[PDB]
Each structure stands twice: as structure tokens, then as C-alpha cells.
Design a protein around this ligand. Structure first.
Ligand SMILES: CC(=O)N[C@@H]1[C@@H](O)[C@H](O)[C@@H](CO)O[C@H]1O
Ligand SMILES: CC(=O)N[C@@H]1[C@@H](O)[C@H](O)[C@@H](CO)O[C@H]1O
Ligand SMILES: CC(=O)N[C@@H]1[C@@H](O)[C@H](O)[C@@H](CO)O[C@H]1O
Ligand SMILES: CC(=O)N[C@@H]1[C@@H](O)[C@H](O)[C@@H](CO)O[C@H]1O
Ligand SMILES: CC(=O)N[C@@H]1[C@@H](O)[C@H](O)[C@@H](CO)O[C@H]1O
Ligand SMILES: CC(=O)N[C@@H]1[C@@H](O)[C@H](O)[C@@H](CO)O[C@H]1O
Ligand SMILES: *[C@@H]1O[C@H](CO)[C@@H](O)[C@H](O)[C@H]1NC(C)=O
Ligand SMILES: *[C@@H]1O[C@H](CO)[C@@H](O)[C@H](O)[C@H]1NC(C)=O
Ligand SMILES: NCC1(CC(=O)O)CCCCC1
Ligand SMILES: [Ca+2]
Ligand code: NA
Length: 955
């Protein structure tokens, strides 16, 4: 084995050759000189984080206030119209005229719309009437529905006025308590190719934006009868009913499921109330779908357990509605002592359900439902499950109605996918009360229930339009959260459902992504989250690990967080801004000739002498649309520049001027430096990616192999080389599909830095692609049999070797071609690994299309800053020798080891690719939960409530 001095000399020579080639071919110094030469076509402007955060929060507050005004006006008009309405049953003679969706009878006339095409809504809509959706099980000929249409036909004028006030208005909707939902503008309902599995089961009374406004958060505890007398069809009905009941809960509600058969016990691992999010609800459903019926019944022990679990106060709760929902069939036990012991003051409601078809006594069940301020329900078949499990929100809404005026508060819901194919939206909510005979105080019996719920939608793209990012760098961004910790805005939130567990095969759920799951978790992150949840203002500068856009690299970077609360609402907004992005360049190019030249630069027929130009698809104009092809997008851009005046009445001037300035600088670089040395031996392509959104590859034929995102803010190598302070080598993918490795080369990148007035700016990155053949020629200058020589980057991705068998698989993770060496050096502190979870992932349904899944990812990086390593790879029965050695000014390492053949010891390979996992364990996250702050306004237990109408004594 050669000594360490010769190894150091070899590594020094290789580093010198590689770094010299990259530096001379790229042109970092030339680009920096070109940037600094003018200093008169642009101006440096600061990015004051606090002012930007305050302005964005103010804009968001103003938008939400506008939506709240619209909701209040709609609710007032609806209440006033419903108050003065005459009941009638003569709909045969006089008909109600309305347009119905999901179509194509006496008393109803239908309307044929025009359905023009609109750009905001991604479908065809009409602005002359409001569509009406009536669920399948609701017959549109009944007198209740006819009266509903008759008195709701007055909302169209206020809808039109609302849309005239703010043309950017999205869907407006009134969901009635009778089942029908009237929305504006008119548009046909949804259908998917009329497949047999495309039945419309939509019911507005079950939508979360309706439930969150129909009542207040609760502390439900589902008590399930699992005695022997319930086995059969009724047990299956009970399981389905419990699942449907759990489907009505949200994040603000807390729930647990218990069972009793001569003994009361929990149904799962929780043992107490849990926040009832997607994971906990999935656990509860899976636990309740595995219960068996046996033993005698004992209501006293079960109710004692249910009351005991509601008096904990040692855990996180809601303290707003303690309700016990019993699911049973029948019995003869009333258990007066338990109710007189645990609630003399009727502080806990008891709802009772009799499930199945049987001949058991239902008297004591109704007595339990009527004594406590509860209700009694019957579920004899699967058909009644949908309706007879969402009716408890009428009982829970009586105190809110009795409170009345002080309960008219606009609430905003979670982020969810619109059912009419609009993306990610949030819905405002305001209930409407029934005030007929209010000035005479006559009935006050049917006035304890709400007419319905009104809603208005705001798209997340409207939120993103209020937080511009192109004055920042590719590493700075906004993000906002709600007091539950979930994310309202983030670059890592995608229009996909949240995955739960491993998908096993034989828009209903919300998109709830926590802040600590959209990024890498850290103690400072936890402190910042807890501090901004409580509506504080702060700023914190620290150092943290950042994952690359392509989930294979992790780099250490300095970050700064600045968070303020959004006034009026309950959201908090932050702004992550790296230290080198406190200043930006604005273009002061106000002159015809220079702009004309910089625009002529982009002509597609100049690519011979200007490289293969790309262009980021940005909103440069209102009339310009991102074409997603970039071959005609640049043509449209050139046409607009050629014909439209540079005044830009409807277009940003800053973005256009920035693009022109970057085009001029990049063309100067290409024409003055790259074009001189046309052919370089080891270089296959020379590229440059700028901040304004222009990327260039000099050999026009090399552009066809440039498979990079035209949006320079989405290029992983751009961000990676901005974070690092040296040359960055990017490893090609293993095989995928398409040219690579030998065809393309190896990408080396370096960011340019300028000090124009003592201020650090990084406005571009450049680099080259290296031919594999010449690199191998200079590496051997072997296919040996007793010595292995490999080169890896920070990440363990093989870039070159000497066996000519490793070099065929270039870019593959080194832990799959030589497991023992990688495992050994992963604990010599030369490599460190981070494991994280991704929830918005799709996996092939395994051997239990695609389904949502959770994928665990692992990334590797250099742990200890030591330039040399040594030791012996004693695997047992042999002893290999290795001299791992890093390279300077580069993220590469050089390894020389004994051949694998000499040691028969074979170990298991370790994989860096994502693994379809099922964790983390939910039974542990509830013992030490995160920090949350629930709502304070709670409406319950009003003494004027009648509650004389239970479900038993009336029949
Ligand atoms: C950037 C770089 O290394 N260029 C090299 C140069 O140094 C060397 O003198 C010549 C002879 O092979 O080939 C070329
Ligand atoms: C003030 C008034 O007109 N009240 C009646 C009410 O008694 C009845 O329940 C309802 C539906 O039948 O029709 C209306
Ligand atoms: C807002 C409202 O209810 N207007 C009603 C209309 O529905 C009804 O058709 C007409 C006579 O039938 O009297 C008026
Ligand atoms: C995949 C695709 O549509 N490519 C098109 C190409 O055929 C066309 O020549 C060019 C000009 O508009 O735009 C792009
Ligand atoms: C891929 C690579 O490293 N190529 C360089 C090459 O530019 C240079 O000519 C030679 C000796 O000067 O060393 C090697
Ligand atoms: C047999 C042995 O020594 N195994 C060690 C282990 O104890 C240690 O925790 C790890 C990190 O240094 O490296 C390996
Ligand atoms: C709210 O509405 C008013 C009137 O249309 C408008 O001036 C204001 O700009 C709107 N809010 C925002 C954030 O645009
Ligand atoms: C509002 O209350 C009155 C009086 O009890 C009742 O007749 C009417 O049906 C209620 N409104 C609706 C839409 O049910
Ligand atoms: N946002 C509410 C919708 C879909 C939903 O209920 O999620 C129904 C009414 C009209 C707009 C769409
Ligand atoms: Ca029983
Ligand atoms: Na909320």
C-alpha cells in the first residue's frame, strides 16, 4: 500500500487539473468583471424584511376583510328575505323557475344558460343566474325544496352586486339545511367520463366549511356497544356508522373511542382524547374495524368510563362541548345513579343511536336521550347512515342561535381541494339565523335552528400574488401558519392529498401539512413555530441544514427568520431570507438603443452566436401566458417586445428591464469569452444561469441535452451552488431514460459574487459539463484487480473509478456497489445522514393506478471537516486498507482501497432511494404532542334552550 504522501500528491494534481479546467472554461472572473464594469445600468436596493412582512400581512388582512364584508352582506340579505316569506302549497299552479346543475316535473321550470368561457374559473360559467345543486336522495318536487327555492331566489341580485364590487370574486355559496346548495356563478356540476363509479354523493351539509360554521368545537367520546347481542349485521352497521361519525370531525375537535361488554376499555392505543387529525382518525377507524361482539352488557361501567375520560384536564382538550354518543341496539337499564352522580347540572350532552333491525326495548335509550340535553336516532340500514349521523349539529347549534348577534363571526377553514376543480382554496363561513316573528316573540321553537351556512372561497394563488418572490434570491421565501401549526402558504405544499400509511390494496379530507413536516425539524424551528403561533413578532438569525430541491443533497446555510402576526385574523406570516440576499439589483436601463440591442439578443436565429437561449415562464405581461414549451414562449415574448411600446400599461417594467439587462450581460459574456476558445478538450458544454430568468448553453447542439427547468428559481444546482462556497459537482442519474453520463457529461457549477459597493451579491451561476472519456484518461494516467480507486461527491454518488465496470454505473449511490466500505466510513464521521418523511407522495400499490403514501428519505453530507482519513476495514477473516482523502475547493473525495475480491465477506447493501414507510408511530406523538392554541369563543349551555324535543317522546 502506498504511503500517504504519494496519495496527497496525486489528489493535489487531480484537484489542480479539475479546478483549473472548471475555472478557465466557465468564466467566473469574466462574468464578475462584466457585472462590475458598468455599475451604471442598475442600482442596488435593500430588502428590509420587517417592512415586507408587514406589507404582505396588511394585504392579506385587507383581502380577508373584503371577503368578510361580502359574507356579512349576503347573510343579512338572506335573513331579511327569509323573515318575510309566506308558506304555500300551491306550486302546481305557480312554478319556480331556476337553473339546475347535474342535469342533461310539475311545479318547476328549468333554465338554459349560455355558458361563456372564463379565464379565472377553469370551466364555463354564466353571470346571469345562480346554479342549484340538489343531492340525489333529495327529490326536487317536495314542498320544502320548492319553498326553499322560492325564498332563496332573492340571493341572485346580492350575488351580482358582490361580484360587481370585486371582480376577482371566486365561488359564492349558500348551503341550506334542507340539502340544496345555491352557488354563483352558474356552472354545471362535476362528472368524470360518466364511468359507472361516478355517482354524485355530494352533500353540502357534510362539507367541513359547513360543519365548522354550524357549531363549535366539541369533546366527543364515542361509546360503542360490543356485547354479544350485537353480532351480525348490526355490528357492521355500527362500525360503518362510527366511521361516518368520525368523518365529521376536524382538527379543533377531540375524540376517543371506547367499548364495553361487562367491562369498559379503550378501542386503541390512545387511552385519552386526541386531536382527531388524519392520522389519529385513521388509527381509530382501523381499531374500530377490528372489534368483535361477546359477553353481557353493562351500561353503568361504560358510562362511568365515558364520564371519567371527560374529566381528565391533564391533556390537551377543547373544553367546549362534552358529548357522549352511544351506539347500541336496546336494553332495559336506565342507570339513573350514574347520571345523577356525574352530571347533576347537565353539563354533558348524551346522544343515543339505536342501530339495526331488532325487537329490543328502546325506552331507556330515549329516556337517556331526553333527560340529558341530547337526542335519539334510529339507523336501521346503510341508507340512513349518511343522514342520521350528521344531525347532531342541529342540537349543538341551539346556544349559538340563542346568543345570536355576538355569534356572527367570520371563520376561515383549512386548506382543501375544491370539488369543482379549482386547486387549493380556503372558505369563509358565516351562519344565518331564522328570525320569523322576531318583532312579536311568538314561536321561538323552530327559531332555534339555523337556515344554513354561507361561504366564499379564496384561492391560494390569490394569496401567492400578494407575496412576490422575484426581488429575493432562489433561497428566500414566505410562509404562513395558523394556530394549529398547519401551513397556509409554503413552497413545499402541493395540490395533492396528504398520504397516510402504506397503501394496501386487494377532496373529502383536508390538505393539512404541519410546518415541521414541510421542512427539516430543528429545535430553533420548534421555538420559532411556538413563538409565532402565539401571535408575536420576532427575528432570529441562525445556521441550519437545508435540503436541496432534488432530494439528494443537504447543505449547511445561514438563515434569518422575521415573523409578524396578521392583524384581525389568526394567521402568522414569516420570511426566510439568507444573509447574502439582503440586497437586490434593479434595472435603470432607460434608453431606446440599449434596450433594442438587448432585445435583439433574444432572437431565435442568433443561437449560432449566442447559444441556445431559454426563458423563465414569468408573468411579464397580462396578455402573455406560460406556454410550458418555451420554444414559442420566447417567440411570443419577442413579438410583444417588437410591437408593444416599452411603456407596458398592463405589464411589469421591473421584470422586463431585469430580463433585458441579464440578456445583455450574458450575451456579452458569450460573445467575448466563450466564442474565442471554440473547442476545449474535456468540455462538452458551457452554460450560464442568471437571476433574471435567462439560461444559455453555448454549443447550440448541446442545448438539446439541457434537461433543466427554465425557471431559474427551480434549478437545484443554482440553489446548491449559492449555498456552497466552492465548485459543486452534480451527479447524473443512474439510468432513468434518455442520454446521460457519456452522452452529456458531468456538471460542475460555481456562483459568481460581486462587491460593487462593499455589499455581497450573487446574481448568477455558471459552469461546464466534463466529458467522461477524457476524465477517465487523466484519472488512469487501469482496470486493476487488487486495488480500487474511486471518486465520490458529498452524497455518496459515484462519479468515476478505474475498473471500467464501476464507470458504467456512474451516478449510482456508492452504498449499492460497495456496501461494506460505505457502512464502515459512515461511522468514521466522514458521512452523516438525515432521515425525513414526505407525505404528499404517490406509490405503486404493493403486494398487500397509484395511491397516496408516506415515503422516508435519507440524505448524506460531510460531517467532520477533516481532510484525510485512514484505517483498516476489518470485516472478519480479512482486513482491507483504505486512505479516504478529500479534495480542496471541491465537494469530492478520493478513495483508494483493497479490492473487494480479496475479501469474501459480503454484507447487505444500503439504499439512499426513498422507501415507502408507515411511520412515525401515532401512539407516541400523542403522549408528547406539539404546541397548539385553540379558539376561545365557545357557545354552549344556554339556560333559555328549550330542548324539550328529543327524538324519543315525539316519534
Ligand atoms: C485549463 C487547462 O488545463 N488547459 C490545458 C493546459 O493547461 C495544458 O497546458 C494543455 C496541454 O495538454 O492542455 C490544455
Ligand atoms: C309563522 C308561520 O307561518 N309558521 C308556520 C309553522 O307553524 C310551520 O311549522 C311551517 C311549516 O309547516 O310553516 C310556517
Ligand atoms: C322572493 C320571493 O319569494 N318571491 C315570490 C316568488 O317566488 C313567487 O313565485 C311569487 C308568487 O308565486 O311571489 C313572490
Ligand atoms: C412538443 C411540442 O408541442 N413542441 C412544439 C413544436 O412542435 C413547435 O415547432 C414549436 C413552435 O411553436 O413549439 C413547441
Ligand atoms: C478533465 C481534465 O481534468 N482535463 C485536464 C486537461 O484539460 C489538461 O490538458 C490535462 C493536462 O494539462 O489535465 C487534465
Ligand atoms: C463495533 C463498533 O465499534 N461499532 C461502532 C459503534 O459502537 C459506534 O457507536 C459507531 C459510531 O462511532 O461506530 C461503529
Ligand atoms: C378590497 O376592496 C376594495 C374595493 O374594491 C379595494 O380597493 C381593495 O384593493 C380590496 N383589497 C385588496 C387587498 O385588493
Ligand atoms: C323559521 O321559523 C318559523 C317559525 O317557527 C318556521 O315556520 C319556518 O319553517 C322556519 N324557516 C325554515 C326555512 O324552516
Ligand atoms: N367551495 C364549495 C364548493 C365545493 C365544496 O363544497 O368544497 C361547492 C359550492 C360551489 C363552489 C364549490
Ligand atoms: Ca346487549
Ligand atoms: Na382555522
Amino acid at each position: 500500500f502506498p504511503s500517504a504522501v504519494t496519495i496527497k500528491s496525486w489528489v493535489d494534481k487531480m484537484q489542480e487539473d479539475l479546478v483549473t479546467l472548471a475555472k478557465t472554461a466557465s468564466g467566473v472572473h469574466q462574468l464578475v468583471d462584466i457585472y462590475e464594469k458598468y455599475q451604471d445600468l442598475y442600482t442596488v436596493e435593500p430588502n428590509n424584511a420587517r417592512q415586507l412582512v408587514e406589507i404582505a400581512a396588511r394585504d392579506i388582512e385587507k383581502l380577508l376583510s373584503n371577503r368578510s364584508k361580502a359574507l356579512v352582506r349576503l347573510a343579512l340579505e338572506a335573513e331579511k328575505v327569509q323573515a318575510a316569506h309566506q308558506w304555500r302549497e300551491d306550486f302546481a299552479s305557480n312554478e319556480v323557475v331556476y337553473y339546475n346543475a347535474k342535469d342533461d316535473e310539475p311545479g318547476s321550470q328549468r333554465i338554459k344558460p349560455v355558458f361563456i368561457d372564463d379565464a379565472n374559473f377553469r370551466r364555463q360559467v354564466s353571470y346571469q343566474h345562480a346554479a342549484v345543486h340538489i343531492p340525489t336522495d333529495i327529490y326536487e318536487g317536495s314542498t320544502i325544496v320548492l319553498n326553499e327555492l322560492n325564498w332563496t331566489s332573492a340571493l341572485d341580485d346580492v350575488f351580482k352586486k358582490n361580484r360587481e364590487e370585486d371582480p376577482s370574486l371566486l365561488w359564492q355559496v349558500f348551503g341550506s339545511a334542507t340539502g340544496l346548495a345555491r352557488y354563483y356563478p352558474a356552472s354545471p356540476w362535476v362528472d368524470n367520463s360518466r364511468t359507472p363509479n361516478k355517482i354524485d354523493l355530494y352533500d353540502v351539509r357534510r362539507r367541513p366549511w359547513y360543519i365548522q360554521g354550524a357549531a363549535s368545537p366539541k369533546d366527543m367520546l364515542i361509546l360503542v356497544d360490543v356485547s354479544g347481542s350485537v353480532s351480525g349485521l348490526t355490528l357492521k352497521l355500527i362500525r360503518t356508522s362510527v366511521s361516518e361519525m368520525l368523518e365529521t370531525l376536524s382538527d379543533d375537535d377531540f375524540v376517543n373511542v371506547a367499548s364495553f361488554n361487562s367491562n369498559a376499555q379503550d378501542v386503541s392505543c390512545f387511552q385519552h382524547l386526541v386531536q382527531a387529525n388524519v392520522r389519529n382518525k385513521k388509527v381509530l377507524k382501523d381499531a374500530v374495524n377490528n372489534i368483535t361482539a361477546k359477553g353481557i352488557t353493562d351500561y353503568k361501567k361504560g358510562f362511568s368510563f365515558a364520564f371519567e375520560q371527560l374529566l381528565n384536564y391533564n391533556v390537551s382538550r377543547a373544553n367546549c362541548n362534552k358529548i357522549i354518543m352511544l351506539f347500541t341496539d336496546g336494553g332495559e337499564e336506565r342507570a339513573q345513579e350514574i347520571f345523577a352522580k356525574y352530571n347533576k347540572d347537565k353539563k354533558v350532552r348524551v346522544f343515543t343511536f339505536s342501530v339495526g333491525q331488532h325487537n329490543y326495548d328502546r325506552g331507556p335509550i330515549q329516556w337517556m336521550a331526553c333527560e340529558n340535553k341530547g337526542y335519539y336516532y334510529e339507523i336501521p340500514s346503510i341508507g340512513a347512515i349518511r343522514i342520521n349521523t350528521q344531525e347532531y349539529l342541529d342540537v349543538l347549534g341551539r346556544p349559538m342561535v340563542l346568543a345570536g348577534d355576538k355569534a356572527k363571526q367570520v371563520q376561515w377553514t383549512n386548506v382543501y381541494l375544491d370539488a369543482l376543480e379549482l386547486g387549493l382554496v380556503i372558505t369563509g363561513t358565516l351562519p344565518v339565523f331564522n328570525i320569523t316573528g322576531q318583532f312579536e316573540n311568538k314561536t321561538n321553537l323552530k327559531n332555534q335552528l339555523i337556515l344554513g351556512v354561507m361561504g366564499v372561497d379564496v384561492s391560494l394563488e390569490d394569496i401567492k400574488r400578494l407575496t412576490p418572490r422575484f426581488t429575493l434570491c432562489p433561497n428566500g421565501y414566505y410562509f404562513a401558519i395558523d394556530p394549529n401549526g398547519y401551513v397556509l402558504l409554503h413552497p413545499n405544499l402541493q395540490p395533492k392529498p396528504i398520504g397516510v400509511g402504506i397503501p394496501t390494496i386487494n377532496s373529502q379530507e383536508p390538505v393539512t401539512l404541519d410546518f415541521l413536516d414541510a421542512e427539516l425539524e430543528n429545535d430553533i424551528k420548534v421555538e420559532i413555530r411556538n413563538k409565532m403561533i402565539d401571535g408575536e413578532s420576532g427575528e432570529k438569525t441562525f445556521r441550519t441544514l437545508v435540503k436541496s430541491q432534488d432530494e439528494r443533497y443537504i447543505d449547511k446555510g445561514n438563515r434569518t427568520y422575521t415573523w409578524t402576526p396578521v392583524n384581525g385574523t389568526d394567521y402568522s406570516l414569516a420570511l426566510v431570507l439568507p444573509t447574502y440576499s439582503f440586497y437586490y439589483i434593479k434595472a435603470k436601463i432607460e434608453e431606446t438603443i440599449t434596450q433594442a440591442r438587448y432585445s435583439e439578443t433574444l432572437k431565435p436565429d442568433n443561437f449560432e452566436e449566442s447559444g441556445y437561449t431559454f426563458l423563465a415562464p414569468r408573468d411579464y405581461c397580462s396578455d402573455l401566458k406560460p406556454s410550458d414549451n418555451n420554444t414559442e414562449f420566447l417567440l411570443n415574448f419577442n413579438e410583444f417586445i417588437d410591437r408593444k411600446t416599452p411603456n407596458n400599461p398592463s405589464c411589469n417594467t421591473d421584470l422586463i428591464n431585469r430580463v433585458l439587462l441579464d440578456a445583455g450581460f450574458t450575451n456579452e459574456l458569450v460573445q467575448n469569452y466563450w466564442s474565442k476558445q471554440k473547442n476545449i478538450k474535456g468540455v462538452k458544454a458551457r452554460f450560464v444561469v442568471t437571476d433574471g430568468g435567462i439560461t444559455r448553453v453555448y454549443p447550440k447542439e448541446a442545448g438539446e441535452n439541457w434537461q433543466e427547468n427554465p425557471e431559474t428559481y427551480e434549478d437545484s444546482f443554482y440553489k446548491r451552488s449559492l449555498d456552497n462556497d466552492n465548485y459543486v459537482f452534480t451527479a447524473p442519474y443512474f439510468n432513468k431514460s434518455g442520454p446521460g453520463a457519456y452522452e452529456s457529461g458531468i456538471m460542475v457549477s460555481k456562483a459568481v459574487e460581486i462587491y460593487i459597493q462593499g455589499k455581497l451579491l450573487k446574481p448568477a451561476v455558471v459552469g461546464i459539463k466534463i466529458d467522461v472519456n477524457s476524465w477517465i484518461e487523466n484519472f488512469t494516467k487501469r482496470n486493476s484487480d487488487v486495488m480500487d480507486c474511486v471518486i465520490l461527491d458529498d452524497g455518496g454518488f459515484l462519479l468515476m473509478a478505474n475498473h471500467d465496470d464501476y464507470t458504467n454505473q456512474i451516478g449510482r449511490f456508492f452504498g449499492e456497489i460497495d456496501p461494506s466500505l460505505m457502512r464502515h466510513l459512515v461511522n468514521i464521521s466522514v458521512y452523516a445522514f438525515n432521515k425525513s418523511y414526505d407525505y404528499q407522495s404517490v406509490c405503486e400499490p404493493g403486494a398487500a393506478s397509484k395511491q397516496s403514501c408516506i415515503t422516508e428519505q435519507t440524505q448524506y453530507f460531510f460531517d467532520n471537516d477533516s481532510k484525510s482519513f485512514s484505517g483498516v476495514l476489518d470485516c472478519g477473516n480479512c482486513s482491507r486498507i483504505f486512505h479516504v482523502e478529500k479534495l480542496m475547493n471541491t465537494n469530492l473525495i478520493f478513495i483508494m482501497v483493497e479490492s473487494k475480491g480479496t475479501c469474501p465477506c459480503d454484507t447487505r447493501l444500503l439504499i439512499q432511494a426513498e422507501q415507502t414507510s408507515d411511520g412515525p408511530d401515532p401512539c407516541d406523538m400523542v403522549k408528547q404532542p406539539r404546541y397548539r392554541k385553540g379558539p376561545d369563543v365557545c357557545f354552549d349551555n344556554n339556560v333559555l334552550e328549550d330542548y324539550t324535543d328529543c327524538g324519543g317522546v315525539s316519534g
